[PDB]
Design a protein around this ligand. Structure first.
Ligand code: HEM
Ligand code: HEM
Ligand code: HEM
Ligand code: HEM
Ligand code: HEM
Ligand SMILES: C[C@@]1(c2ccc(F)cc2F)OC(=O)N(Nc2ccccc2)C1=O
Ligand SMILES: C[C@@]1(c2ccc(F)cc2F)OC(=O)N(Nc2ccccc2)C1=O
Lengths: 241, 60, 49, 378, 53, 75, 49, 378, 75, 96
């Protein structure tokens, strides 16, 4: 407790002012979400239609939604049935309550992962450092072992076991699925989940700066034109005698 | 041998009517040319967008 | 610049991505007898079969 | 006769924006009034378009804000234009007040005193808005500010419970705050018109603090084009915030939904409230702290009575200039201490900066003006 | 009552302002076409075919 | 509300002005401009700068002290 | 459903009379009732969309 | 000098409410302007206190209105003051317009033309409010009015879907309507100030239609006390509605929650829209009907051009008096037909009343004025 | 904005007035009042009343007809 | 709501005590049933409108909170509905 360590600056393909997300790295990172995180983590604000622009086709995302059963509201009996899964439906919920989340995870609540990048200082750098930074405790420090050592988590005792050295995932393009690379892809995706506007924001950003680079000197030249009359005026005082 | 500024004035800028007509024709042609360039600059900077999407389409 | 802001504020009033999503409805045909008009909920606003 | 001059509506526009005799010599620092007006209309337009989609229930407030940013077409730019527009509003407010202080523009008693009301009204406005998305900082910020009223002797508890509509910040509080936050910028707009009316009795002060009747120019074209350039510089600074750093001034805890059971360990205001926050927690007493906080804003209404110099402006006053810049840097120090934990060096220096704030204004600047008079044999 | 504005002076004043009234009409039409991105007219402008398919 | 014609009495002052179309918008913009900003900087530095440096020194001390306070060395 | 002077549909609001094709016959309405896009895969179930 | 006369703010109050030269002889019928202002502030205050508790989601809109009426302390009086205040607003609007028509007050071109804008703005205001509690009449009323725009050639469908935010009246529509309904009475308040500005150029007309410069009295004490009495008569009529008949002007179907799948068999407007509703459904064509409806309100802007009499007022004009009262009774007939089913006697008489409305205004009243001139050898 | 002193020219008119404290608020209120309202009613009845009666007659016919239309007697 | 009106505080507590409610969860994440309080609303016969229709052979019994204000006649209509059940006339057959 009390003492803290703060994350380093990793050079993401999306860090710099005009730099978009790697969408191939978004694609891989969804797969990390589906395979690993979704069993414990809610993502209440991303639906299957959101992927269609970004990392999949319309047909692909329909098929990924088809993998899960949903629950739809009733027919004539007043019933609640289960449903093959669509595109309008949100990412599926592991738990009905927060209390059910706490009951599975020995008292600790796994937080929703929709905004987790924007909800922590450091953003993706913190999450990467949390994932790749699991180590042995130092001498002096004993845990519960219900709680686990991480130097990046405040207090040092995280209720999350390392979810990461497990070498998982169907890969399609088929890049190597190392602990470093699996963390790189998930963080790239979790940025997108926090900020879908990221790519549009920066395209607009370029368009702004280019326009302002035109418009600022031109409006300046307009104000200089009108003000010329005054800035070059000569006064003379000519009193009698 | 008269200037191009002089011609742009004489033909287009003198009447406020034609001056306004120049800007609006100017704005339509500018919107096309600016967007086309500013997309292509942003496109050349980036290259992991749906540059990739040859992979996953056309199979359908 | 004015066209772009105004269009964006205009578009915000248009049907959000929220609302544009595909719906689609399953109907059981043998459950509609000869003569009869059956009324189903679709898209918010009714479908007569 | 012109149409512009004697048409009963165009008359008002003429006397405010066209034919208004203006000082030839007003600087950059006089741009902030029009910029504050721009800021108000920006907050109005983006805010209305947010109000078209936002819902004000505890169950749905966070979700509706999320809905704006993913699903509503261009809801993200409107949302971020609004959040960062609020910051732009306070940047312009502070530059404008500071201009008034330095240049003796506060000698326009009624104009100044309405500006104070304008400041207290935008402060109340931006507080109630920040609550609305129902993040963690929204909630605990709502908790801390509302509880400032509970320090009032005898009636204090009854007053806070009345503004809650309950025993804490809850359902009744959020909906209230939406309604009050909608109405108050229209009240601001009316008080801003009254502000401008009082000003037009005298016209503008200038950098020199000397009467400029001898050298007036028409507002149009000169300050119409100067204000246009000013607005495009405001748009640059706002758009830099929205399109390149949208979370820079935001607290990350506001991206976590409101929890009524658990505080954040830190708890800090938005940047523009950090000086006043530093002044409050400088006092080891409940009532003392809030009284200090109230007095830190309300002191501006006493600044007219503490003018002591035979010159209006600080332009010809090197002593006062040094003490003014000492105030600005004291305020920078207070904004630093505001944003930091209540621990070892920060407590005592926060106390010293708080003393110095009140020492500069109440004692030191009115002593400098008197010395400067004596120095000029005046 | 609007017989007032009928006579050779008023016809000449009509003739003087007609190239201006029609050029303003040209400003308005091209302005409305541009601001709405209007389909019918802008498919027929030989550059600015940035729909294509 | 103040109006031209009713402001004040002025006698014996000649103003000479040129049209903006007759003249430069940016006359000697760098060659006269940068000497002026240099002269303006000199005129004000001693009034503006020393409070902010005194903030910076209290900033750098205060951050260093707090960081170094959050450490032990014996128990 | 099953109302009016044509044995299809009556709108009680301003007095629109539709036939069994949903075609307008009487009263204020300009157009026949909207036919959606549909296909039959079985004669037990129809998908409309 | 007085403080009241030359203080820049008190100046405006002085010239509007104290020292304003007013006709000695203005009747009862001139009370409705102040009463409209009272109605606006009443709608503002009760509406804000409703906005403190109302939520604007489809799932919760009906429930929040219910919450006001059972659970919120005195929420029922505030709710019913608001609903019946809207009706009071339209009663005062119609008396005020009718005064203008009869007395030739429309010769004040700018004052009148702004009053038309004021009428179209309160109409839009009260429509959007009625939607808000999300009853059956709220929904289908929302459906019918919004669809009036779909009759516009070429662009009509695109326009309605834009104002829906979707393929019908839905989630996007209700929240929109809350935001627009909040903003528009503040816009009304500003246009009402512009209305009063244009009026003060001339002062008031009077019953006789003759210039009253020869016999002006100060507004205070005479019309301050006359307006007080008028306000207390407005309070009586409003409170009679709220405390004895709160559902008298309400449709019972609005107490059933909105159903998007099923209409009511009847479907009728609130009383103040029944004449225009009768005019719309008189035409067996889609576009024809809406054009007739629009033209039934917008005709007021043509009433200045159809003045034909050498006297301003109808006081000395028995022919015009008979034709005016024939219009009022035609409007009563149209309000009757509005509230009844589209069946046998009601269709043809609704058509005849619709013809007569446009016949009285466009043809018959301007023929009466000409005959009356000829009769007086003028 | 119009002001007293600037309205119009009036010559040769004497006005006599009494204080409100010297005089009755309701002077001959019923005895002169009700003759006046009776005279006012007479002056206007023939202009006001005949449209509304013509509404009432069309109201009473129209309601009676519609009620009687919603009945059969042979089939 | 009854406490002001027609019962005592003790009486209305006891009437609420007659029904079981469902309260939101303890630590397992559970949903349990509860003896019934005063804050709880009148108990619902059906989870859906469709379940209402399924019990009552296609017809939906409407909510009774506002039913007086939601019908012309008010209480007069409801009284006349309740006390006015009779045999059909000749010509008229129903479903039953
Ligand atoms: C998959 C690679 C994965 C990611 C990514 C991940 C993220 C993550 C974050 C960022 C936290 C928040 C830490 C904080 O509060 O600052 C966190 C918290 C917990 N998680 Fe997790 N999580 C990943 C996957 C998994 C899996 C597979 C499990 C179950 C073994 C798991 C569980 C938890 C728990 C418990 C916590 C709460 C820790 C605490 O505060 O005590 N997560 N997760
Ligand atoms: C709602 C935010 C405000 C708006 C819209 C605004 C409006 C403006 C405008 C348009 C000007 C004229 C141009 C200029 O000098 O800047 C001005 C001047 C003035 N303002 Fe404000 N103002 C506001 C806030 C304030 C505040 C907070 C104060 C200080 C308590 C202030 C005090 C004054 C004074 C004294 C002047 C006279 C300046 C001079 O001529 O030197 N105003 N105001
Ligand atoms: C009358 C015009 C206004 C309306 C209708 C309005 C409405 C809104 C709404 C709906 C929200 C909630 C959505 C959101 O958080 O993004 C919001 C939040 C906000 N409002 Fe306003 N607003 C208005 C003007 C103001 C003004 C004048 C200010 C003060 C500069 C202000 C400061 C803010 C702030 C700080 C927030 C929180 C933004 C955030 O971080 O999310 N707004 N307002
Ligand atoms: C927002 C509702 C309105 C308000 C607050 C209002 C305000 C008033 C006020 C205070 C008066 C002066 C006292 C009096 O004569 O009644 C008045 C006069 C006038 N109003 Fe309005 N008005 C409104 C609606 C209208 C409408 C709908 C029209 C007609 C299109 C109208 C046209 C006029 C005219 C012509 C007068 C001059 C009357 C005369 O002196 O005889 N106003 N208004
Ligand atoms: C800016 C001040 C106003 C605010 C904040 C406001 C807000 C409200 C709110 C929250 C409701 C929904 C609750 C309810 O239905 O009882 C409502 C409904 C209503 N509003 Fe307003 N209102 C305002 C002024 C207006 C004005 C000027 C009118 C036009 C006379 C108007 C006409 C009504 C009507 C007819 C309803 C429906 C009442 C009902 O039957 O329940 N309101 N408004
Ligand atoms: C935006 C803000 C604020 C704005 C203006 C104001 F005058 C005071 C405020 F606290 O509202 C709010 O809840 N916080 N946050 C906050 C307040 C007190 C303690 C901790 C955070 C603000 O900074
Ligand atoms: C209150 C009302 C209304 C107010 C003002 C207006 F100009 C038009 C309106 F329809 O809003 C509304 O939805 N109805 N109801 C209604 C409208 C059309 C058909 C049936 C009912 C109104 O009377």
């Amino acid at each position: 407790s009390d003492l803290e360590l703060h994350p380093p600056s990793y050079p993401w393909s999306h860090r710099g002012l005009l730099s978009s997300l790697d969408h191939t790295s978004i694609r891989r990172g969804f797969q990390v979400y589906k395979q690993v995180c979704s069993s414990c983590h809610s993502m209440d604000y991303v639906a299957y239609r959101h992927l269609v622009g970004v990392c999949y086709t319309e047909d692909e995302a329909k098929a990924l939604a088809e993998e899960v059963e949903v629950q739809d509201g009733p027919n004539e009996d007043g019933e609640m049935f289960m449903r093959p899964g669509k595109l309008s439906d949100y990412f599926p919920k592991p738990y009905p309550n927060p209390e059910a989340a706490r009951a599975a995870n020995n008292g600790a609540l796994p937080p929703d992962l929709s905004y987790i990048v924007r909800a922590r200082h450091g953003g993706e750098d913190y999450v990467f450092s949390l994932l790749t930074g699991y180590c042995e405790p130092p001498t002096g420090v004993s845990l519960r072992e219900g709680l686990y050592f991480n130097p990046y988590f405040p207090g040092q005792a995280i209720g999350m076991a390392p979810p990461i050295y497990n070498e998982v995932l169907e890969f399609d393009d088929g890049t190597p699925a190392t602990m470093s690379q699996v963390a790189k892809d998930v963080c790239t995706f979790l940025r997108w989940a926090a900020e879908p506007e990221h790519d549009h924001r920066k395209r607009m950003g370029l368009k702004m700066l280019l326009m302002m680079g035109l418009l600022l000197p031109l409006v300046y030249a307009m104000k200089r034109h009108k003000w010329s009359v005054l800035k070059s005026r000569k006064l003379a005082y000519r009193p009698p005698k | 041998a008269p200037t191009l500024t002089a011609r742009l004035y004489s033909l287009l800028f003198r009447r406020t009517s034609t001056f306004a007509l120049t800007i609006v024709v100017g704005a339509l042609f500018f919107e096309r040319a600016f967007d086309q360039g500013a997309d292509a600059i942003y496109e050349h900077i980036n290259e992991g967008k749906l540059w990739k999407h040859i992979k996953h389409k056309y199979e359908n | 610049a004015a066209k772009n802001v105004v269009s964006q504020f205009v578009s915000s009033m248009s049907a959000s991505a929220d609302v544009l999503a595909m719906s689609k409805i399953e109907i059981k045909l043998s459950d509609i007898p000869e003569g009869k008009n059956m009324a189903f909920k679709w898209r918010g606003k009714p479908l007569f079969v | 006769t012109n149409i512009r001059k004697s048409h009963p509506l165009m008359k008002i526009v003429n006397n405010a924006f066209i034919d208004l005799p203006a000082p030839s010599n007003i600087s950059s620092w006089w741009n902030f009034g029009s910029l504050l007006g721009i800021c108000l209309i920006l907050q109005i337009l983006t805010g209305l378009f947010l109000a078209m989609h936002y819902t004000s229930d505890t169950t749905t407030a966070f979700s509706s804000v999320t809905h704006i940013c993913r699903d509503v077409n261009y809801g993200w730019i409107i949302r971020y234009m609004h959040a960062n527009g609020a910051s732009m509003f306070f940047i312009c407010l502070y530059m404008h007040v500071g201009r008034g202080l330095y240049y003796g523009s506060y000698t326009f008693l009624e104009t100044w005193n309405i500006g104070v009301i304008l400041l207290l009204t935008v402060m109340a406005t931006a507080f109630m808005g920040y609550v609305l998305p129902w993040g963690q900082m929204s909630f605990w910020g709502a908790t801390v500010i509302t509880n400032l009223l509970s320090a009032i002797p005898y009636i204090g508890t009854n007053l806070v419970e009345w503004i809650w509509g309950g025993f804490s910040v809850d359902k009744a509080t959020l909906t209230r705050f939406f309604a009050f936050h909608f109405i108050l910028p229209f009240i601001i707009m009316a008080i801003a018109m009254v502000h401008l009316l009082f000003l037009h009795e005298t016209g503008s002060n200038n950098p020199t603090g000397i009467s400029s009747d001898v050298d007036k120019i028409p507002f149009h074209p000169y300050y119409t084009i100067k204000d246009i350039l000013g607005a495009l510089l405001l748009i640059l600074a706002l758009m830099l915030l929205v399109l390149f750093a949208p979370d820079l001034l935001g607290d990350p805890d506001n991206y976590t939904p409101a929890n009524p059971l658990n505080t954040p360990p830190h708890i800090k205001p938005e940047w523009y409230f950090l000086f006043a926050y530093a002044i409050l927690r400088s006092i080891p007493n409940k009532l003392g702290g809030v009284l200090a906080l109230a007095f830190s804003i309300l002191i501006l209404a006493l600044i007219p009575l503490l003018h002591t110099s035979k010159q209006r402006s600080m332009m010809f006053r090197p002593l006062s200039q040094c003490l003014f810049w000492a105030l600005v840097a004291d305020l920078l120090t207070l904004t630093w201490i505001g944003g930091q934990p209540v621990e070892h060096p920060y407590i005592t220096i926060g106390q010293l900066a708080s003393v110095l704030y009140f020492l500069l204004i109440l004692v030191l600047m009115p002593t400098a003006g008197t010395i400067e008079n004596k120095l000029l044999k005046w | 009552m609007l017989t007032r504005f009928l006579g050779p002076r008023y016809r000449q004043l009509a003739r003087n302002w007609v190239p201006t009234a029609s050029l303003w009409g040209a400003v308005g039409a091209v302005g409305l076409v541009w601001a709405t991105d209007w389909r019918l007219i802008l498919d027929w402008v030989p550059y600015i075919n940035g729909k294509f398919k | 509300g103040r109006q031209f014609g009713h402001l004040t009495r002025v006698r014996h002052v000649i103003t000479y002005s040129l049209s903006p179309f007759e003249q430069r918008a940016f006359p000697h913009y760098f060659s006269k401009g940068i000497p002026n900003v240099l002269r303006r900087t000199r005129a004000c530095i001693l009034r503006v700068a020393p409070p902010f440096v005194a903030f910076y020194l209290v900033y750098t001390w205060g951050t260093q002290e707090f960081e170094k306070s959050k450490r032990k060395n014996p128990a | 459903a099953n109302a009016g002077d044509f044995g299809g549909y009556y709108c009680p609001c301003h007095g629109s009379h539709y036939d069994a094709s949903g075609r307008i016959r009487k009263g204020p309405a300009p157009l026949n009732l909207e036919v959606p896009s549909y296909e039959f895969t079985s004669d037990d179930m129809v998908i409309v969309g």
